[PDB]
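Reminder to self: keep the SMILES exactly as supplied, no canonicalising. Ligand is A1ARX.
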Amino acid sequence: SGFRKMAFPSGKVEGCMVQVTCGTTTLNGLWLDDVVYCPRHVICTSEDMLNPNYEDLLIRKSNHNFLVQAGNVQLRVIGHSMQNCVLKLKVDTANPKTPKYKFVRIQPGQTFSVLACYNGSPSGVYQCAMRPNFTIKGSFLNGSCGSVGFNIDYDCVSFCYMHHMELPTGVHAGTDLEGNFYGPFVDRQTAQAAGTDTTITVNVLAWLYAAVINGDRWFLNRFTTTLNDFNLVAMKYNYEPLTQDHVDILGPLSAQTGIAVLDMCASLKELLQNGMNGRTILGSALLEDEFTPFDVVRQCSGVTFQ
Amino acid sequence: SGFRKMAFPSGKVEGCMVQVTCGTTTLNGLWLDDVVYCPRHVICTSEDMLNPNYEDLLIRKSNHNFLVQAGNVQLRVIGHSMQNCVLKLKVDTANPKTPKYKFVRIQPGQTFSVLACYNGSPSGVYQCAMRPNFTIKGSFLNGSCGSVGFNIDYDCVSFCYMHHMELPTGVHAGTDLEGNFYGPFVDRQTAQAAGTDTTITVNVLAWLYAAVINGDRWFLNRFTTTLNDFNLVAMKYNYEPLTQDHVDILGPLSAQTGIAVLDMCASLKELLQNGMNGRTILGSALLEDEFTPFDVVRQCSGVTFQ
Ligand SMILES: *[C@@H](CC(=O)OC)C(=O)N(c1cncc(Cl)c1)c1cccc(-c2cccc(Cl)c2)c1
Ligand SMILES: *[C@@H](CC(=O)OC)C(=O)N(c1cncc(Cl)c1)c1cccc(-c2cccc(Cl)c2)c1
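Structure tokens returned for the bound complex:
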């Protein structure tokens, strides 16, 4: 038992991380087969990052302008191209540590692990959710650009996030690995800002089921509610609507605990209207929304990856 | 910016994890050079784990009674011995993935990363603190015995924990890698229980400094307090005493934020006596005590490992 914010084992991704330097800008790249992927703003200087024309900036570059270091070994760049907001650097060596992988784009509300990196060297691993407003609440300092987010399914790494920038509220924005930003953000320095977020209702319900599996039951009750009646309450507290698909997805957790989904909604309703009255759930005094139903099943059942 | 419960990158440990089977019991082992380390209760059956005589149980075993699998490759056991509560299985192959490592024993209040494993296959990574009562609040299911805890310093893995058992309150107990239990626990089935815990005061102060570094300041005030006066309050709220060494250790964080340590103690005093009045700190509505001053400096400054 127990319930932790648990990341995927990071080894398969550690073996892909490299350092990319262009001019005085150094950041991280992702080395898969004979290509290194990195944020295209590596080619920008201080004054460039104001209002850049990336096509113009890149035609002025040569292969030799990109220094790629994999550990203490230099990788010769033999080609380069832009794909949306990422650079693809062709190198003359295929990464022998390339895992089986996919490039997937995730949905707001889904979770992933982040391998934070500096100078091509991994620093730490943590779990993130993509917020409804397409930001992530990460932990990133200068030099972390190019760090990636991912999930692992058996032996295959599904890369879903490349870090690009920090927004003024201290949250983070980036792209999928095709270089397409998550949300209405751009790789230039503007006054862009996050804008309004909501709480991921299906995940809160998942986490309440995790709590019951782990012996926290004080918030349960005999009442039930209808889906429409619950969604009236969710709207009032800035929770996003619950759908019948969400109810279906919560089916297994409902069957394991014996608590009907709509019954757990009544409990969430009460928790929203009354607070927690000085008690905790799974060691938290807030309603936690960064665990998906899959995350709860994985952790409270125990799936591994090889 | 941002602040997350961040684990060390797990790759160096993933390459050491193996499956150890004796009879019908399967758990995890740690393969370093030509030795596999695992909990000695792998040699016990259901009825054995009641009141076992491990010396008696082990003399009845042969090398061939221990099946060790590293992935899909079987390791031939050529010797075996007991060391306190761990088994050391000599195998005929040195692990080519052995990192530089040390066996260290940590103090209550210190943190480490856990690589949870099942059947020798890594499942997830998370950060843990050793509680004052020598338990850890982990996330472990059946089959997780033998999973290890560790820290990484540059390139060297300091192993500090091997998982053995879950206590009745759902918290976890284990040994250092010399096989000596943390706390007053034994590898037999008794009515043993955790017993009383306290909150790690120096870590809460560290985390308040992390909050200030990250822009949360609402809990600051103009008041100060003396060390003795603060410690009177800490005792009342089940916090452990703060020492002058703790104050010294908080020196760098104090100098970076410009907030005297004793001033932050006054803030903690107010937070204990008034609660948080519906506000949060670093996304928590509770005072967090599982970040050390080192953890805060590492994350809010950005040290990597290679
Ligand atoms: C990358 C900066 C770089 O290329 O060299 C250090 C970087 O990690 N940046 C960052 C990311 N996350 C958090 C923090 Cl505090 C910094 C970063 C630094 C400076 C500018 C930018 C940036 C600005 C506008 C648009 C974009 Cl896409 C990036 C990012
Ligand atoms: C290990 C059990 C094993 O050898 O085969 C599965 C195991 O991981 N156990 C465990 C650990 N953490 C959480 C949970 Cl829910 C289970 C475990 C299972 C059964 C018994 C014991 C045990 C009992 C008394 C003493 C000791 Cl040292 C271990 C652990």
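Points to follow up:
Residues 198-301 of chain A form a domain with the main proteinase (3clpro) structure, domain 3 fold (CATH 1.10.1840.10).
The first strand of chain A starts at residue 17 and ends at 22.
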